[PDB]
Write a protein that binds this ligand. Structure first.
Ligand code: ZN
Ligand code: ZN
Length: 68
């Protein structure tokens, strides 16, 4: 038996996760773009962090991140 109405929403899961939380705000930061530089697009934050590293801009891995 198939449903005549819309009960279940067909979704595609090929994403790591909808959003990445800011190291401070933990806000839903959209993860989009070809670069590996992330920015907390929260109005009032604008904090930048190196995508992989969920923290501040790590100067240690500075260079390996940003683009990848
Ligand atoms: Zn933030
Ligand atoms: Zn890093």
């Amino acid at each position: 038996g198939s449903a005549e109405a819309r009960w279940d929403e067909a979704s595609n899961v090929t994403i790591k996760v909808s959003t990445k939380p800011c190291p401070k705000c933990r806000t839903p930061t959209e993860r989009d773009g070809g670069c590996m530089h992330m920015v907390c697009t929260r109005a009032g934050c604008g904090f930048e962090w190196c995508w992989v590293c969920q923290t501040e801009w790590t100067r240690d891995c500075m260079g390996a991140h940003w683009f990848g």
